[PDB]
Structure formats: C-alpha cells, structure tokens
Amino acid sequence: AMDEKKKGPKVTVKVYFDLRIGDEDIGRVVIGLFGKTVPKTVDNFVALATGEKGFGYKDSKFHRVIKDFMIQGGDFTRGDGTGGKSIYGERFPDENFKLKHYGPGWVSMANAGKDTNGSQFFITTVKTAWLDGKHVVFGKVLEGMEVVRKVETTKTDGRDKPLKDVTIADCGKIEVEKPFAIAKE
Ligand SMILES: [Zn+2]
Ligand SMILES: [Zn+2]
Incomplete structure (x- = not known):
C-alpha cells in the first residue's frame, strides 16, 4: 500500500557517531x-x-x-x-x-x-513500547544499525557496563537539504 496516511516524522537534520570498542574503530551510526x-x-x-x-x-x-x-x-x-x-x-x-x-x-x-x-x-x-509517554523520542538510526548491534552485543558486567569502553570517537552534524518522512517502524 502507498500508506499516505502512515507517513511518520520528518528527518530535518542528521548526526553521525563514529564508534570504537576499546581501541577498535567499528563504524559509523x-x-x-x-x-x-x-x-x-x-x-x-x-x-x-x-x-x-x-x-x-x-x-x-x-x-x-x-x-x-x-x-x-x-x-x-x-x-x-x-x-x-x-x-x-x-x-x-x-x-x-x-x-x-x-x-x-x-x-x-x-x-x-x-x-x-x-x-x-x-x-x-x-520495540520498547513500555517507555512510550515517559521518554521523549527524537530520532531514528538511518545508517549503521549493524554498528549499533556490535555495541548491543559487547560483553558487559553485572551492572550492564561494557567490559571495554564503547566510545564516540567522532561526532557531528550532517545537513539535510530536503526534510523527508520515514515510517513509524
Ligand atoms: Zn590495541
Ligand atoms: Zn523511564
């Protein structure tokens, strides 16, 4: 279906994060x-x-x-x-x-x-619907979800802290020339 009525929010600007686990560069989100x-x-x-x-x-x-x-x-x-x-x-x-x-x-x-x-x-x-109405949602990963998954599956301790630090080695803004709607999924 063309889903005209199911258009979600418009992406108006982007942010990138270049991530590391320990001293290993693992990619861009x-x-x-x-x-x-x-x-x-x-x-x-x-x-x-x-x-x-x-x-x-x-x-x-x-x-x-x-x-x-x-x-x-x-x-x-x-x-x-x-x-x-x-x-x-x-x-x-x-x-x-x-x-x-x-x-x-x-x-x-x-x-x-x-x-x-x-x-x-x-x-x-x-999907984390139990947080709906309690935490303000403001973005969606558009590229590098596989990089997010690398972080998600890194070894952690009993306090859910990664055993090796996961850091944002670099970050910044990427302009979007024409805002565009994405799906609510
Ligand atoms: Zn090393
Ligand atoms: Zn909460």
Whole structure:
C-alpha cells in the first residue's frame, strides 16, 4: 500500500557517531532527527554533537548496554549515568510524547523521572513500547544499525557496563537539504 496516511516524522537534520570498542574503530551510526516534531530536544542533541557550547558527546561512552533492549550514552561529565547536562541547563522538560519507541533504532532521551532530560540518550534495539509517554523520542538510526548491534552485543558486567569502553570517537552534524518522512517502524 502507498500508506499516505502512515507517513511518520520528518528527518530535518542528521548526526553521525563514529564508534570504537576499546581501541577498535567499528563504524559509523547516522541518526535522523525530527526537528519539526521536537525542535528543542533535537537542537540540544545536535549542539552536543557539534560541541559548540564548549561541551558535548565527543569521546564520551555508552556506559550502559542491555542486549535485546537498548544502548545508553551521553554522560559526558561523569561517564556513569550520574552526569550530563543540556544546552538549557542540567534539566529540561519533556517537550512532547508525539513519537513512540516504534522499533529497533529509535533514539530517545534517558531520564530520572518527569522533566529531567539532560544529555543522556538511548538507542533502542527492539520495540520498547513500555517507555512510550515517559521518554521523549527524537530520532531514528538511518545508517549503521549493524554498528549499533556490535555495541548491543559487547560483553558487559553485572551492572550492564561494557567490559571495554564503547566510545564516540567522532561526532557531528550532517545537513539535510530536503526534510523527508520515514515510517513509524
Ligand atoms: Zn590495541
Ligand atoms: Zn523511564
């Protein structure tokens, strides 16, 4: 079917992450971001990817990895889930819950309760519908899901911490000339 009525959100800008496990380069993940749907949340993520406020994601780690669930990163101040901050302050409100965690590869803000978005985020590796309405969804992996899967399956300890650090060796913004809708899947 042509699915005119099933068009999802528009990708308005992209972010890339070049990842490492230990000292091994493992490839690039490209995330499409929904700047019409959640502009404030997208703008934060993009600025943290460029580093333009003087802090951000470069060389931070994915400190929590749960196979068949998600990979979590963005704590560039403490690397352990205790830190991070947004470009608006330590915390900012949940912008909206228009988007759901539709399937593998959706990108959503980590939080410690209502209105506690900072810099931490997660990339789902399955549909995580139980987070719908609680975590703000703002992007989807468009390229390099296989690289996400490498992280997903890295050995972890009993605290779900990778045994070897998984780091964002490089990151930045990629402009999108014409925004484009993707499927909610
Ligand atoms: Zn080595
Ligand atoms: Zn939660």
